[model samples]
Target: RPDLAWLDEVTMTQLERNPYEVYERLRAEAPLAFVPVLGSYVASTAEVCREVATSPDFEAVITPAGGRTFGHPAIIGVNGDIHADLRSMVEPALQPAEVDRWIDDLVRPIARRYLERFENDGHAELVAQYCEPVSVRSLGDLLGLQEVDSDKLREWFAKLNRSVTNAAVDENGEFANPEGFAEGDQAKAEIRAVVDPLIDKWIEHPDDSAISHWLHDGMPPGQTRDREYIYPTIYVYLLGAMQEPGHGMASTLVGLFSRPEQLEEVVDDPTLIPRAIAEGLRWTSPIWSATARISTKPVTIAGVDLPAGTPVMLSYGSANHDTGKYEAPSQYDLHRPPLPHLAFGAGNHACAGIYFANHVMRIALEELFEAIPNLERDTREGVEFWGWGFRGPTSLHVTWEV
Candidate 1:
């Protein structure tokens, strides 16, 4: 094992500037390095990442007891039967079959609406004008929270994105300023406030949205049915549903457009769109690092022993790029062998929004190329994919012939 003291510095800043530069070495040398900043062991290889992510000995903690606002139990925070129960309630909505059924009608229109606004401009910032609105609005529709202020929701998602992930670490990778905690607490309260009225509305007038379905169906089988759990579960779902797909969409577009040859291939054969989407996710996972998990029992990973209550951070971004897993892992190869990536995670705690998020990105790309087949990056702006925990382009300035 090499000295990993430098791994701490590779976070927020180096991770954004060039993650592979650091992760590549770690994956080859250490595979599992402990970071004092995160107070957990970080897994850099795909094998180790999978082992820790799916292990029954580990548990998620989305809102750590210190410096958080949502006192309610989020599905991502709880473990064991409670987490399984919450996952089951939301699973039906996120099933591939359900996503396929609703996507064409529900999500496609949202994608078209956003694209129509800027399709004729010949030049537009895809992230702000297109991806962000489609992601936020579609989430509102799915949750049956209609007539929301898109601008406000976008701002709230931005706040929640930070609060939920990167805000805990700064550009220097040290413990973040205490104010980050304050802002996170404030963001959680605001998000709950936004969802409270919608929860009440769904209760009064049952609809086909996921929230209404959960309210009507009550908990999944094998778990105690309780109405109280519905709000918190929906609250956590809203938090996830708002931001992730948008970032994923933006990252995918960046990956595709950056390589003209790959873009051309996808253009010629639109059937490859889904594979392109998969490659996009694997190339630069919007989720750079999964949330921390605490070990419930002593476990061994990569031959290292972890005691109960040890904090573990699984680097999905690193695992996705491990050369041992994928050849030339940095390249965006749409035709690469289809191996499961940890973008949405794995096992019992896998993101319930996976199917829906994929539907949104796939539809958005389908609609985008159909509307503007020749779209390319605006060369005038600096093209950079940057972030700490949730990675994505700073801005996707793109142009197309009208």
Candidate 2:
């Protein structure tokens, strides 16, 4: 076994609240260090994470967490040609051009439906009612499963997250119990089945749904015959694509609310919405340090050495907060000069739903502020956000003029 860089003071409690401040300290002192809670080395600082993610010296190999948590064959788990083939086929549907169509009809109406629920109430729990549902439904529809049960999607997403969080190993890194693993497996089964009838239905007459794209988009006619191999990728999309933008919407909302003056600026000028989304994604992201990259051999990143096959978690959220790039890194500044932040990972492994999620998040905030006036967090009751890797607020309680 390789003796890795070790650090202390990391725990579940702090990761959920705000881990970036600690990340700043790590960036300045120890850019790459081991976090036992995560059971892997975390690469802090923007440059280090970027180098590790983009450089050929490191590989997008699976971590024990990736294997046990999101353990099916999926897009994020492969490398080079295999990963390329999967992404090329599935990602075209999420490109900016195609996303516009989904946004115009598929996404906005769904946002509208959720807005209708709380727009009249003058107050609402935005995460459960608005953010999560809107993100999940749009994900399902865009994937061609328009008839999807949003409830089931949400349930399954949570179950899978839990399975990853409470895997067989605890702090000791040994199998204490399988806790959420079995439920996560069951959820994976249901999620894989989501495309069953939908695929059969699409096969009868191909349409514009993403599932249709996956089966027939660039492939030669009969090459689409057996796509069972694609399930791992699709099911991975169910969780990653769905969770990324939903949590993004909520985190962006929370960041804006925390700075009421800034929120007002965006509310006043709709164009500022894009800046808000960028800043929010940089400041508070949905995906944290779960994507693991392994050192192929002896490698030095930001002055730290790692042995071969060493698992390094690319802290995307932390990298986005690197003080070397952004002064006052902890605070959210809408006008922060644009640097390619890694809220989504960098290089070939960048998120497939980038355009789609960005479009959805933009429309999400646009529709949100449009429907309700004078929106701000209901500070009377404190809001709670949980999790380390898959992070987001549990509730976004807000109030506005009726």
Candidate 3:
């Protein structure tokens, strides 16, 4: 094992910049070490992360004492039957078959439309031109919010994400951010102004869109059937559906292009794109830190006793790299065997948009590669993948021939 004493000395800043080395140490030294700096128990190894994430003793609601983080009861923050019921409502639209149809009907067209803007240019910032708009537009179109200005939707989402992720906090370790909370409230209000009307429209005359599906499906067994809460629910869903896929797609592309040989293999055999995306999700999980869960009762993880209300950071980025779980977890292998990963989370609170996001990303890669052959990274600038809480390159500059 490694020296455990240094675990207490590492700063949050260091952990934020690059957690892999730190996690490697933690997994070897103390798989479930309680770091005083983070004031949270870190679940480093894959086994412990799985236990901490899936165990009933730990709840997904991160801040137990605080009110809802998103200014609404989102599926991510809720626990038990409510979460299950909410998930049940949205799961159908994101089913693999349904998402495949979305690939043809929604994702592909959106990708093509975005790529057309730069296909003739021979060079483009893939993140800005292709990845960002495709993610936002396809998701917006699905949720019946496409009519609203895309720029406005993007702006609101940025603020909403900041508010929720950086919610106010203090010494007691309570998650609270008055400013962020207020911005979130305003963002929701603005979104509701647009979505509520659409909700009413969908309720009156149903369509094939996600909002229409949510409307006509009726409430799940446990929740109220009232229509008032539906707008906020849809808002929450849109927020999630809008954010992660672009980063995931951009990261996957960067991961592939960084390894030219793998990139060539993928380009040569397009069938491997999905597997590549899957490996990419593991290799560079968009959800940099694992979803947090507060312990509801005392439990022992990796033989380390954690008290009730303990904040546990299940480091998926770390778990994905665990040597026990993956071979050469650091290297990206497109041919690696499929297994459960913590990227979209696990158990009940897993991302409802997993299949949908995968299809979109796969299509994004296919469409971009097909439209612009022989795509390669721009070597004039250094590539830096940044973000601690959420991971991905901010911009992926690439050049190609039409």
What overall lDDT goes with each candidate model? 0.74, 0.77, 0.73
* lDDT of model 1 at position 261: 92
User: RMSD for each model, in Å, please?
Assistant: 3.2, 2.6, 3.4
Q: Per-residue CA lDDT of candidate 3, range 44-119, in tens?
A: 7778877777888988864321234353455666777777667777788788887676467788888888887789
Worst 10 residues of 2 by lDDT: 1-10
- Higher lDDT: candidate 2 or 3? 2
Candidate 3 runs further than 4 Å off = 1-16, 35-38, 63-68, 167-186, 219-228, 231-235
Quick one: best lDDT, which candidate?
2
Identify the superior model by lDDT, candidate 1 or candidate 3. 1
Taking all chains together, the TM-score of candidate 1 against the true structure is: 0.90
Candidate 2, residue 28: how far the Cα is off, in Å: 3.2
Q: Residue-wise lDDT of candidate 2 within 74-112, one digit each (tens)?
A: 778788777777878887877787667547687789989
TM-score, per-candidate, Cα-based: 0.90, 0.91, 0.87
Q: Rank candidates, lDDT, best first.
A: 2, 1, 3
What tens-digit string does per-residue lDDT give for candidate 1 at 14-118? 565667787788787788777544545778888988887788888776524222534455776787688767777777877898788877898788888888888
Ranking by TM-score: 2, 1, 3
The candidate 3 region of ten consecutive residues with least summed lDDT is 63-72
